[PDB]
Amino acid sequence: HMSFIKSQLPIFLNNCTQDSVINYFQNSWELENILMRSIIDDETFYINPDPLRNPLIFYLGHSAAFYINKLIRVELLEKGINSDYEILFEFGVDPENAEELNQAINWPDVRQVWDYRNKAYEVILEVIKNTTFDLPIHASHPLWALMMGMEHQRIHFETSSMLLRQLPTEKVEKPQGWQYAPSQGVPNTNKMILVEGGTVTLGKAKDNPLYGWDCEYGDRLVKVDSFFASQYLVTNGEFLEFINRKGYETQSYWNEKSWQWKEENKVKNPKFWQFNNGKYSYRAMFDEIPLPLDWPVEVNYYEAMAYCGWKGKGTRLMSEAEWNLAAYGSNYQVDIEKVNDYNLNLKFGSPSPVGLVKTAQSHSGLWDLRGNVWEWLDENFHPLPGFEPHFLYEDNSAPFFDNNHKMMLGGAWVTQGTETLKYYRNWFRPNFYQHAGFRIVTNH
């Protein structure tokens, strides 16, 4: 599995020494550099390959400016590097339509943004070397702003990889050591497993010794009834059957809003499939390859539900509490080394065959609940009891408690940092594409 490109595991706040944080910060930054350096021509940075996201030049500068802005806010920095750039690159976008984004969106030169990145790197490195790391770090400690910036950089490694995937292959260059998972051919039978009901506690305590975003915190007990879930995420080969049974052409599997999305975008298959010469090819990060039939299918929420509609019989997606019960049970002390047991943290540079990582079966019997691809949940993004916005970033999650965003959990092959662990709560508009799939659920 992928070894040459290595991502350092997250660190407990009780062990966030200066030396360990230097290593984690250096690793977070060098990883993003490797991804951004995969674009061959500078002119490509002014394309926005995802029509619902900013041009690539924005994301080249956004991670660096985020660090600077948060460090200034806690007064660990007395001035920025470029106040215009810190405004321009301050916050991203989350539009419902490409027309909204186009109306909203003069960009600087690529070389100028790279120079800003390099200056910002040296400025943060000097802050780290000149600040006392009095253990333990915590949410009211000034260094929380640094913990925030590193996790924000690592999330944008994930979200930018999806933008580069939407560029033509001729515009990107695979980094040395990038390795896709193998494919074993057709997948095994995807059996439904009974998950025994139980009570779960959602949320994270304020004094938990791990960095977290504001929406992670709170406390909610939820009694979860028993339910059936497929042992594997739905595979490309399973979704091919859906296509061959006219899944995209039957309104009864969709609803008015999702059908409208499909029609307006002329969708006939998942985004990274392409039909040519009788067969589907598949677009990995940098190459088009024969469709890996045993990999989890990558779809948006509309497509996942349309598949559930074709299955019928009340087939549905899990709730947040059901996923937590299946993944972590009713008990919990996080063990960071367990990240190595799943397709997380660049173990592979792609999704893997369901069940290939033999250490990736949860105690519930379900495979790749953690890792491989994010999995969609029928759960509107919402706060847990006790939620409180952090003063450093009050708009992080509160604007998205709008019943217009569905959640996803578990992490993907590209996921790094604290986002690979138990408490991270992820959310997207249901039409949006991520490294995300789904499994199916029935009550009986």
DSSP assignment letter at 245:
T
Q: Does 383 bind Na ion (CB under 5 A)?
A: no
Q: Which of Fe ion, Na ion, Cl ion, none interacts with 294 (beta carbon under 5 to 8 A by kind)?
A: none
CB 422 within 8 A of CB 159: no
Question: Known binder of ligand: residue 156?
Answer: yes
- What's phi and psi for 377, nearest 5 deg? -130, 140
End-to-end CA distance of the chain, in Å? Answer: 38
Residues 325-354 interacting with Cl ion (rule: CB under 5 A):
334-335, 338
Closer to Cl ion by CB, 9 or 334: give it. 334
Q: Which residues pair with 201 in a beta bridge?
A: 221
Closer to Cl ion by CB, 130 or 333: give it. 333
Q: Which of Na ion, Cl ion, Fe ion, none interacts with 410 (beta carbon under 5 to 8 A by kind)?
A: Na ion
Q: Which of Cl ion, Na ion, Fe ion, none interacts with 78 (beta carbon under 5 to 8 A by kind)?
A: none
Length of the chain: 444
Question: Known binder of ligand: residue 382?
Answer: no
Closer to Na ion by CB, 309 or 410: give it. 410
Q: Which helix (H) or strand (E) holds 263?
A: helix 256-264
Closer to Fe ion by CB, 25 or 227: give it. 25
Q: Does 151 bind Na ion (CB under 5 A)?
A: no
Q: What one-character-per-residue DSSP string does 368-416 give?
A: -SSSSSEEEEEEE--PPTT---BTTBTTSSGGG-SS--EEEES--TT--
Q: Which of Na ion, Cl ion, Fe ion, none interacts with 338 (beta carbon under 5 to 8 A by kind)?
A: Cl ion
Handedness of CA 140, 141, 142, 143 (dihedral sign): negative
Q: Which of Fe ion, Cl ion, Na ion, none interacts with 334 (beta carbon under 5 to 8 A by kind)?
A: Cl ion
List the one residue out of 249, 254, 290 whose CA is nearest residue 267. Answer: 249
The Cα 50–Cα 265 span in angstroms is 13
The Cα 375–Cα 296 span in angstroms is 10
Q: Which of Fe ion, Na ion, Cl ion, none interacts with 375 (beta carbon under 5 to 8 A by kind)?
A: Na ion
Q: Does 410 bind Na ion (CB under 5 A)?
A: yes
Question: Known binder of ligand: residue 152?
Answer: yes
Closer to Cl ion by CB, 175 or 209: give it. 209
Q: Does 375 bind Na ion (CB under 5 A)?
A: yes
Closer to Fe ion by CB, 107 or 228: give it. 107
- Using alpha carbons only, what angle is made at residue 395 by residues 389 and 398, rounded to the nearest 5 degrees? 65
Write out the binding residues.
62, 152, 156
Report the interface residues with Cl ion, using CB under 5 A. 334-335, 338
Report the interface residues with Na ion, using CB under 5 A. 368, 375, 410
Write out the binding residues for Mn(2+).
62, 152, 156
